[PDB]
Design a protein around this motif. Structure first.
Motif, PDB file in Angstrom:
ATOM      1  N   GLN A 229      -7.104  88.692  20.942  1.00  0.00           N
ATOM      2  CA  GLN A 229      -5.806  88.429  21.913  1.00  0.00           C
ATOM      3  C   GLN A 229      -4.715  89.140  22.268  1.00  0.00           C
ATOM      4  OE1 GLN A 229      -4.251  84.658  18.883  1.00  0.00           O
ATOM      5  NE2 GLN A 229      -6.508  84.737  18.540  1.00  0.00           N
ATOM      6  N   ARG A 230      -4.436  89.618  21.735  1.00  0.00           N
ATOM      7  CA  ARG A 230      -3.464  90.709  22.409  1.00  0.00           C
ATOM      8  C   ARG A 230      -2.494  91.445  21.384  1.00  0.00           C
ATOM      9  NH1 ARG A 230      -1.463  85.851  22.431  1.00  0.00           N
ATOM     10  NH2 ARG A 230      -1.298  85.495  20.299  1.00  0.00           N
ATOM     11  N   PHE A 231      -2.385  92.890  21.488  1.00  0.00           N
ATOM     12  CA  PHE A 231      -1.194  93.737  20.481  1.00  0.00           C
ATOM     13  C   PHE A 231       0.695  92.594  21.025  1.00  0.00           C
ATOM     14  CE2 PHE A 231      -3.368  97.077  22.556  1.00  0.00           C
ATOM     15  CZ  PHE A 231      -4.346  97.889  21.237  1.00  0.00           C
ATOM     16  N   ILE A 232       0.735  92.996  19.442  1.00  0.00           N
ATOM     17  CA  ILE A 232       2.050  92.887  19.250  1.00  0.00           C
ATOM     18  C   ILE A 232       3.099  93.404  20.299  1.00  0.00           C
ATOM     19  CG2 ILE A 232       4.096  92.934  17.275  1.00  0.00           C
ATOM     20  CD1 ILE A 232       1.779  90.936  16.812  1.00  0.00           C
ATOM     21  N   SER A 233       3.883  93.303  20.860  1.00  0.00           N
ATOM     22  CA  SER A 233       4.408  93.313  21.695  1.00  0.00           C
ATOM     23  C   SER A 233       5.620  93.080  22.767  1.00  0.00           C
ATOM     24  CB  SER A 233       3.614  93.410  23.743  1.00  0.00           C
ATOM     25  OG  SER A 233       1.784  93.824  23.103  1.00  0.00           O
ATOM     26  N   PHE A 234       6.754  93.087  22.933  1.00  0.00           N
ATOM     27  CA  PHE A 234       7.948  93.000  23.476  1.00  0.00           C
ATOM     28  C   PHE A 234       8.092  93.254  25.219  1.00  0.00           C
ATOM     29  CE2 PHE A 234      12.389  93.969  24.213  1.00  0.00           C
ATOM     30  CZ  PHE A 234      12.498  92.963  23.902  1.00  0.00           C
ATOM     31  N   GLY A 235       8.089  91.984  25.719  1.00  0.00           N
ATOM     32  CA  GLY A 235       8.026  92.085  27.298  1.00  0.00           C
ATOM     33  C   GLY A 235       6.307  92.608  27.656  1.00  0.00           C
ATOM     34  N   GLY A 236       5.462  92.550  26.796  1.00  0.00           N
ATOM     35  CA  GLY A 236       4.543  92.886  27.443  1.00  0.00           C
ATOM     36  C   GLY A 236       4.187  94.790  26.768  1.00  0.00           C
ATOM     37  N   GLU A 237       5.182  95.138  26.079  1.00  0.00           N
ATOM     38  CA  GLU A 237       4.751  96.329  25.801  1.00  0.00           C
ATOM     39  C   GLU A 237       4.413  96.678  24.575  1.00  0.00           C
ATOM     40  OE1 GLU A 237       4.935  99.000  27.642  1.00  0.00           O
ATOM     41  OE2 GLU A 237       5.379 100.965  26.230  1.00  0.00           O
TER      42      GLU A 237
ATOM     43  N   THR B  22       9.415  93.700  14.390  1.00  0.00           N
ATOM     44  CA  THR B  22       9.744  93.300  16.124  1.00  0.00           C
ATOM     45  C   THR B  22      11.741  93.519  15.750  1.00  0.00           C
ATOM     46  OG1 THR B  22       8.109  91.658  16.345  1.00  0.00           O
ATOM     47  CG2 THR B  22      10.636  91.614  17.372  1.00  0.00           C
ATOM     48  N   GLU B  23      11.759  92.879  14.590  1.00  0.00           N
ATOM     49  CA  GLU B  23      13.607  93.730  14.005  1.00  0.00           C
ATOM     50  C   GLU B  23      13.947  95.142  14.213  1.00  0.00           C
ATOM     51  OE1 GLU B  23      15.678  92.523  10.421  1.00  0.00           O
ATOM     52  OE2 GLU B  23      16.271  91.285  11.478  1.00  0.00           O
ATOM     53  N   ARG B  24      12.619  95.974  13.506  1.00  0.00           N
ATOM     54  CA  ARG B  24      12.560  96.989  13.639  1.00  0.00           C
ATOM     55  C   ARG B  24      12.720  97.661  14.634  1.00  0.00           C
ATOM     56  NH1 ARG B  24      11.022 100.227   9.245  1.00  0.00           N
ATOM     57  NH2 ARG B  24      11.924 101.841  10.358  1.00  0.00           N
ATOM     58  N   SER B  25      12.174  97.288  16.037  1.00  0.00           N
ATOM     59  CA  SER B  25      11.860  98.000  17.546  1.00  0.00           C
ATOM     60  C   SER B  25      13.024  97.696  18.030  1.00  0.00           C
ATOM     61  CB  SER B  25      10.387  97.344  17.492  1.00  0.00           C
ATOM     62  OG  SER B  25       9.466  97.902  17.131  1.00  0.00           O
ATOM     63  N   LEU B  26      13.673  95.989  18.146  1.00  0.00           N
ATOM     64  CA  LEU B  26      14.686  95.592  18.629  1.00  0.00           C
ATOM     65  C   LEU B  26      16.028  96.221  18.709  1.00  0.00           C
ATOM     66  CD1 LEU B  26      13.167  92.744  20.497  1.00  0.00           C
ATOM     67  CD2 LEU B  26      12.267  94.769  20.769  1.00  0.00           C
ATOM     68  N   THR B  27      16.147  96.407  17.234  1.00  0.00           N
ATOM     69  CA  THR B  27      17.846  96.139  16.345  1.00  0.00           C
ATOM     70  C   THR B  27      18.367  97.616  15.679  1.00  0.00           C
ATOM     71  OG1 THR B  27      17.335  95.057  14.188  1.00  0.00           O
ATOM     72  CG2 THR B  27      17.063  93.471  15.837  1.00  0.00           C
ATOM     73  N   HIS B  28      18.851  97.678  15.362  1.00  0.00           N
ATOM     74  CA  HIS B  28      19.305  98.584  14.487  1.00  0.00           C
ATOM     75  C   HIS B  28      20.685  98.352  13.609  1.00  0.00           C
ATOM     76  CE1 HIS B  28      21.175 102.630  12.776  1.00  0.00           C
ATOM     77  NE2 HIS B  28      20.422 102.524  12.061  1.00  0.00           N
ATOM     78  N   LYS B  29      21.046  98.855  12.399  1.00  0.00           N
ATOM     79  CA  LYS B  29      22.149  98.373  11.579  1.00  0.00           C
ATOM     80  C   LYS B  29      23.290  99.607  11.437  1.00  0.00           C
ATOM     81  CE  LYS B  29      25.740  95.566   9.323  1.00  0.00           C
ATOM     82  NZ  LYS B  29      26.336  96.202  10.359  1.00  0.00           N
ATOM     83  N   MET B  30      24.334  99.992  12.009  1.00  0.00           N
ATOM     84  CA  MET B  30      24.529 101.718  11.601  1.00  0.00           C
ATOM     85  C   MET B  30      24.990 101.506   9.898  1.00  0.00           C
ATOM     86  SD  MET B  30      28.531 102.217  11.385  1.00  0.00           S
ATOM     87  CE  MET B  30      29.351 100.935  11.201  1.00  0.00           C
TER      88      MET B  30
ATOM     89  N   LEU C  46       4.659  97.021  19.988  1.00  0.00           N
ATOM     90  CA  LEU C  46       4.768  98.190  19.512  1.00  0.00           C
ATOM     91  C   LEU C  46       4.687  98.926  18.069  1.00  0.00           C
ATOM     92  CD1 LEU C  46       7.495  94.719  19.572  1.00  0.00           C
ATOM     93  CD2 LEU C  46       8.006  96.759  20.286  1.00  0.00           C
ATOM     94  N   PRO C  47       4.650  99.901  18.300  1.00  0.00           N
ATOM     95  CA  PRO C  47       3.859 100.636  17.485  1.00  0.00           C
ATOM     96  C   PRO C  47       4.785 100.328  16.451  1.00  0.00           C
ATOM     97  CG  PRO C  47       5.225 102.093  19.500  1.00  0.00           C
ATOM     98  CD  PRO C  47       6.091 100.426  19.676  1.00  0.00           C
ATOM     99  N   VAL C  48       3.987 100.679  15.217  1.00  0.00           N
ATOM    100  CA  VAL C  48       4.488 100.661  13.825  1.00  0.00           C
ATOM    101  C   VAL C  48       5.066 101.183  13.247  1.00  0.00           C
ATOM    102  CG1 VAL C  48       3.547 100.014  11.778  1.00  0.00           C
ATOM    103  CG2 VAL C  48       2.227  98.760  13.500  1.00  0.00           C
ATOM    104  N   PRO C  49       6.216 101.272  12.495  1.00  0.00           N
ATOM    105  CA  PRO C  49       7.410 102.355  12.325  1.00  0.00           C
ATOM    106  C   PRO C  49       6.688 103.113  11.166  1.00  0.00           C
ATOM    107  CG  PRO C  49       8.725  99.997  12.548  1.00  0.00           C
ATOM    108  CD  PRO C  49       6.759 100.107  12.575  1.00  0.00           C
ATOM    109  N   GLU C  50       6.957 104.108  11.629  1.00  0.00           N
ATOM    110  CA  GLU C  50       6.059 104.952  10.709  1.00  0.00           C
ATOM    111  C   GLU C  50       6.557 105.497   8.802  1.00  0.00           C
ATOM    112  OE1 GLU C  50       5.104 107.806   9.554  1.00  0.00           O
ATOM    113  OE2 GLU C  50       3.676 107.717  11.844  1.00  0.00           O
TER     114      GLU C  50
END
Length: 151
Positions: free
Chosen positions: A80-88, A143-151, A90-94
């Protein structure tokens, strides 16, 4: 150049045809199985073994930049698709891949041991009871790991 891990969504019941195509193309991939621990409704962590996908309809695939941006993978039938943001994609966090690959390469007893360095939110996702709800929480998490961050 460097290779990343991506989440590929596919039609769950057609895993054999999809995996065969990916193996033909000589990709590194794995569809992880549901772990042997889960949190009950009463919140106690219990044992089981159901031989189910960890995230039904999703697999992890390692690829370079030209492979994920080309249509060779997404043209595979029932992919179906890659898990993406805006079509791009998203690499899985390490740290997520570290835990998943450890469970792939070690025994069930070692995978069930209390391991330091597992991100708490990802550990709690692995304990989720329902497989489809587990998938939705995982997608939201990476998705939250890719698009957000908290100090």
């Amino acid at each position: 150049g460097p290779m990343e891990w991506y989440v590929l969504q596919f039609t769950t019941t057609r895993f054999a045809a999809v995996f065969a195509h990916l193996e033909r193309l000589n990709f590194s991939y794995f569809c992880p199985m549901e772990t042997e621990r889960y949190r009950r409704p009463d919140k106690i962590i219990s044992y089981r073994e159901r031989r189910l996908p960890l995230f039904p309809g999703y697999l992890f695939i390692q690829a370079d930049f030209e492979e994920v941006h080309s249509t060779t993978i997404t043209a595979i039938p029932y992919v179906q698709r890659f898990i993406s943001f805006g079509g791009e994609p998203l690499p899985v966090p390490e740290d997520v891949m570290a835990e998943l690959l450890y469970r792939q390469s070690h025994t069930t007893a070692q995978a069930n041991l209390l391991r330091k360095s597992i991100p708490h939110d990802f550990a709690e996702i692995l304990l989720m009871d329902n497989p489809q709800q587990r998938s939705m929480a995982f997608i939201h998490y990476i998705t939250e790991r890719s698009l957000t961050h908290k100090m």
